[PDB]
Design a protein around this ligand. Structure first.
Ligand SMILES: O=c1cc[nH]c(=O)[nH]1
Length: 234
C-alpha cells in the first residue's frame, strides 16, 4: 500500500522535522480534501489533496524502475517507426513515461532498465561514466587467439580517432564469448569484432553495473527492481 503519515509528508514538503510538522498540523494549518486535519498520524492516501495555509502541496508519484529481458524484434525508443517498442511487454499505468536507461538494438536481447528517473538514468548512461556492461556474444567464426589481448589493449573501430577502452573477453566455446566493456559507443560490440575480423551473430546483455539479469526471467518478462538493486546498479 502507498501511504504515509501526514506529519511525515508535511515534514518532507516543508523541509522541517517531523516534530515541527506535528506542531503545524495541530496548529490547524494543514488541510486535506478541504477539511482541517489536526492529527499527525493521519494516514495520507494518494487520492488526498493536501494544503498548507491554503496553498496546495501535491503528492509525488515515487520513481519506478524495472528489469526487462528484452526479446528480438522490438526497439527501445520511438525513433524508428517501423518496429513495435518494448512497451508492448509492459502492463503498467502511463507506461509511455518510461524510458530505457541504456538502449538495445532491435535484435539484441537481454537486460534493459526501464525507468522514469532521469537522474538515476543519466548516472548510468552518461558517456563520461565508467559503467560496466557484460554481454554474451555469439560469433560467426571461432574466436581468434589474439582477440582477448587486442580487446585488452583496446582496438580501433572503423573510422574512430581513439581506441576502445580495455575490455575483458572470457571464452566459453570457440564461437560463444562473454565480453565486459565499460563504454557505450554506438554498436560497439559488433564493431569491435568486425574490427578484428569476425562477425557477431547473436548478442545478449547479462549485466549493467551492479544489476544482473535474472536467470529465470523469460524473454519478454520484466519486474520491478528491488530496493537493493535500485540502491546501486553501479
Ligand atoms: O554495447 C553495445 C550495444 C549494442 N550493440 C553493440 O555492438 N554494443
Amino acid at each position: 500500500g502507498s501511504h504515509m503519515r501526514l506529519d511525515k509528508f508535511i515534514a518532507q514538503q516543508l523541509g522541517v522535522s517531523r516534530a515541527i510538522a506535528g506542531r503545524e498540523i495541530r496548529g490547524n494549518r494543514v488541510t486535506v480534501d478541504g477539511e482541517i486535519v489536526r492529527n499527525a498520524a493521519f494516514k495520507l492516501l494518494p487520492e488526498h489533496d493536501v494544503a498548507y495555509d491554503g496553498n496546495p502541496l501535491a503528492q509525488q508519484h515515487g520513481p519506478r524502475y524495472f528489469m526487462l529481458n528484452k526479446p528480438q524484434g522490438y526497439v527501445c525508443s520511438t525513433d524508428d517507426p517501423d518496429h513495435p517498442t518494448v512497451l508492448y511487454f509492459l502492463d503498467e499505468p502511463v507506461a509511455w513515461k518510461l524510458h530505457a536507461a541504456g538502449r538495445l538494438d532491435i535484435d539484441t536481447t537481454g537486460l534493459v532498465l526501464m525507468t522514469d528517473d532521469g537522474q538515476w538514468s543519466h548516472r548510468i548512461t552518461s558517456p563520461r561514466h565508467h559503467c560496466e556492461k557484460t554481454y554474451l556474444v555469439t560469433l560467426e567464426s571461432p574466436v581468434a587467439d589474439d582477440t582477448a589481448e587486442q580487446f585488452a589493449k583496446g582496438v580501433q573501430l572503423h573510422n574512430e580517432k581513439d581506441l576502445t577502452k580495455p575490455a575483458v573477453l572470457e571464452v566459453i566455446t570457440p564461437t560463444q564469448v562473454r565480453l565486459t566493456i565499460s563504454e557505450g559507443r554506438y554498436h560497439q560490440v559488433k564493431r569491435m569484432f568486425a574490427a578484428v575480423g569476425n562477425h557477431v551473430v547473436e548478442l545478449h546483455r547479462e549485466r549493467i553495473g551492479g544489476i544482473t539479469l535474472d536467470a529465470d526471467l523469460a524473454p519478454g518478462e520484466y519486474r520491478p527492481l528491488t530496493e537493493e538493486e535500485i540502491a546501486s546498479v553501479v
